[PDB]
RNA sequence: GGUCGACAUCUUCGGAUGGACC
RNA sequence: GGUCGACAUCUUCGGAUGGACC
């Protein structure tokens, strides 16, 4: 619904280079960039659908995006286990963000 | 009138902070 | 009370913009 995954991102590529390429789609998203791959969560599922049709290359019928002059394939169908692990990853990060301020109050 | 390539608004990355907004 | 890893403050090198401040 809200997720796509960019793979085969060239080595040494900074996160900003990845984020910039996705910004060209004109939709708001969060980005996690690990191990030459990047997960992308759009704000709503509808804009993800519209993002897919922009990445879709009708010549080879596959989703692609250019990064540093190279062609990177994107996945629209995430394996169930990978997505499940991913939402838990977020939940921890979000709760970690809120735990920070809570503990700061305790320091008083 | 004086000051300003050393002034402001917005803003990418990076760094340092804690609470921020409604 | 609600929303914030998608909230903000400060800051180095930059970008855009025009006036900014006394
Ligand atoms: K993400």
| Protein-proximal positions, strand B, CB < 7 A | 12-14, 18-19
Q: How many CA atoms lie within 13 A of A10 on its CB side?
A: 12
Q: How far is the CA of A38 from the centre of ligand 1 (A)?
A: 8
What number of other Cβ atoms are within 10 A of residue A103's Cβ? 9
Residues 46-85, chain A, CB closer than 7 Å to nucleic strand C: none
Indicate if CB(A100) is under 7 A from strand C.
Answer: no
Nearest in space to A38 (alpha carbons), one of A75, A88, A92: A75
List, in sequence order, the alpha helices (H) in chain A.
Answer: 15-23, 45-55, 80-106
Query: How was this entry determined?
Result: X-ray
Q: How far apart are CA A88 and CA A101, in angstroms?
A: 21
- The structural domains of chain A, ordered by start, are 1-108 (3.30.70.330)
Spatial distance from the CA of A95 to the C1' of B1 (Å) = 58
Start-to-end C-alpha separation, chain A:
43
């Amino acid at each position: 619904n809200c997720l796509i995954k960019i793979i085969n991102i060239p080595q040494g590529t900074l996160k900003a280079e990845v984020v910039l390429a996705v910004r060209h789609l004109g939709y708001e998203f969060y980005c996690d960039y690990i191990d030459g791959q990047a997960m992308i969560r759009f704000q709503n599922s509808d804009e993800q659908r519209l993002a897919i049709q922009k990445l879709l290359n009708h010549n080879n019928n596959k989703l692609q995006i250019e990064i540093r002059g190279q062609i990177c394939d994107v996945i629209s169908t995430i394996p169930e286990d990978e997505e499940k692990n991913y939402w838990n990853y977020i939940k921890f990060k979000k709760n970690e963000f809120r735990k920070f301020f809570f503990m700061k109050k305790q320091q008083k």
